[PDB]
Amino acid sequence: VYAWNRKRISNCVADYSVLYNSASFSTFKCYGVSPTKLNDLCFTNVYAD
Amino acid sequence: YNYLFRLFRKSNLKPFERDISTEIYQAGSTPCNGVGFNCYFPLQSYGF
């Protein structure tokens, strides 16, 4: 955590609903955006830390 | 804590529609069954 690793996400699509539809993840949270809305959205970049 | 609001509903209210229901709201891939994962109690307190 003192050396956190960042992917930069661009020029692509993904099913962001899988992040909470899959039981593989013990918690999911969202801020500004709503978790059910994510598949309708578009962005210039996303940073995956 | 005696002041509260509805955090979740299936759809938006019509004008002057009123709704006191406390049933557990389900978002997706797991049912509520009176509980959680993808399921939520529909009210919250302000707790002033």
* A20: chain B residues, CB-CB within 8 Å: 27-29, 38
What are residue B13's phi and psi, to 5 degrees? Answer: -65, 140
Q: Are strands A7-9 and A46-48 parallel, antiparallel or unpaired?
A: antiparallel
Nearest to A21 by CA among B25, B26, B42: B26
- Count of CA atoms in the C-beta half-sphere (13 A) of A29: 2
8 A C-beta contact, residue A35 and residue A18:
no
Three-class DSSP category at B6: strand
The technique is cryo-EM
Give me the DSSP letters along chain A: -TT---EEE-S----TTHHHHSTT-S----SSS-GGGGGG---S-EEE-
Q: What are phi and psi of A24, to 5 degrees?
A: -60, -20
**Quick check: A39 and A48 in contact, CB under 8 A?**
no
Contact A35 B27 (CB under 8 A): yes
Nearest to B27 by CA among A14, A34, A32, A40: A34
Q: CB-based contacts of B40: which residues, under 8 Å, 6+ apart?
A: B7, B8, B24, B25, B27, B32
Cβ separation B29–A23 shorter than 8 A: yes
Size of interface A-B (CB pairs under 8 A): 15
